Amino acid sequence: ARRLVMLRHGQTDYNVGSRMQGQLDTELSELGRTQAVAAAEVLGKRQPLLIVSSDLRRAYDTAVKLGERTGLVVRVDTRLRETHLGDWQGLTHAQIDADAPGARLAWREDATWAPHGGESRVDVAARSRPLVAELVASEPEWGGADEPDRPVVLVAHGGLIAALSAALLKLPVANWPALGGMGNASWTQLSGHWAPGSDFESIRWRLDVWNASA
Amino acid sequence: ARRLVMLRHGQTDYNVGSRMQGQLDTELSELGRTQAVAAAEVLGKRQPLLIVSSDLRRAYDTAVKLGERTGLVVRVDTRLRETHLGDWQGLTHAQIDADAPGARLAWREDATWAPHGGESRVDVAARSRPLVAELVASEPEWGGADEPDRPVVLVAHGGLIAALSAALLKLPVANWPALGGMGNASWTQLSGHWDFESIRWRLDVWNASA
């Protein structure tokens, strides 16, 4: 059984502001930076197998604190980026509710709806899920012979983790909105179970932890 | 929104044995007693509005430690008991897999299936969910005007919390196996957003520790 940990980046300025980030390369705040250190303490004790991070700085800076703690290099992948929010990026909840009222609240309940020029949850999962399959195929150590509980740690963003977790869990798309939003420097854990020798689509994923804090 | 927190009891003098408990009234271990004291510190700071506990001692003992920290009377409800596991109660995984190879692993994947004389996951949800419906209609302070964040704390068991959460989340029954098992002195939090079937529940936290 393979353990997969996903960690949301620490607080940014936009978070405090309720301003849609998407794929804008915003910076960690000081509190956010200290949050990543606290999180690296807890996740570090689990002895990760490897760290893969979003290339956006707020996730990358968070991941690096874990890498320091563990002595592990941080690999980078654009497929771990937050939902692209299109024309909404850089606008706040207040501003969005003015132009197209109800649109934002409708968005959280429909994993297929995308802001104009952005991605839906379904889009983000199509983009990130193969990364997990690659890692399944590339790391025989993972859930394997020697130390089968050492996790793979993805450092990313709230939307991505919800979209990717729902997809790995093979939840119907109608139920993806059931997963509430993760906190800053909080993590989620799925465990991958396969009948010995089986394919990637034959792996059954179970939700171990959703949104634990440090 | 209404915050609903479900807390699993601390370690017992039994879990380590890989022995199905079900509704066996097993006791906390010494760690369990200290874990319940630990959890009450964390959940106590959130100041619950009320505490409802299973009558199984391992949950009841845990709840009382939260109740002491908070000054709350602990309500008791048999509807919060763990899944009754029928002929499996008290047997080890080794014995069950010897009697019925595959049945145990097949069981964790089918929320409708019950060991002979037991309950299914669906059974546990049907008996426990009306307690949630009662509370929503019974406590207007919950998510109310002055202090809308005061949570309701159900102190129960891993099987029940998985089944009840999945039911409140209105997941298809085929998808209930996605919610894995909670650890000793772990908690789960759903929030209720806008009748009672018209309430939409969101998973805020699943299986956080202390």
Swiss-Prot record, chain A:
The active site is at H9 (tele-phosphohistidine intermediate), E82 (proton donor/acceptor). Substrate binds at R8, R58, H157. Transmembrane segments: none annotated. Keywords: Hydrolase, Isopeptide bond, Ubl conjugation. CDD domains: HP_PGM_like. Its EC number is 3.1.3.85, 3.1.3.70. It holds the Pfam family His_Phos_1. InterPro entries: His_Pase_superF_clade-1, His_PPase_superfam, PG/BPGM_mutase_AS, PGM_Phosphatase. It catalyses: (2R)-2-O-(alpha-D-glucopyranosyl)-3-phospho-glycerate + H2O = (2R)-2-O-(alpha-D-glucopyranosyl)-glycerate + phosphate; 2-O-(alpha-D-mannosyl)-3-phosphoglycerate + H2O = (2R)-2-O-(alpha-D-mannosyl)-glycerate + phosphate; (2R)-2-O-[alpha-D-mannopyranosyl-(1->2)-alpha-D-glucopyranosyl]-3-phospho-glycerate + H2O = (2R)-2-O-[alpha-D-mannopyranosyl-(1->2)-alpha-D-glucopyranosyl]-glycerate + phosphate. SMART domains: PGAM. GO terms for biological process: dephosphorylation. Optimum temperature is 45 degrees Celsius. Is active between 20 and 50 degrees Celsius. The keyword Hydrolase applies. Involved in the biosynthesis of mycobacterial methylglucose lipopolysaccharides (MGLPs). Catalyzes the dephosphorylation of glucosyl-3-phosphoglycerate (GPG) to glucosylglycerate (GG). GPG is the preferred substrate, but GpgP also exhibits low dephosphorylation activity on mannosyl-3-phosphoglycerate (MPG) and mannosylglucosyl-3-phosphoglycerate (MGPG) in vitro. Shows only trace of phosphoglycerate mutase (PGM) activity. This is Glucosyl-3-phosphoglycerate phosphatase.
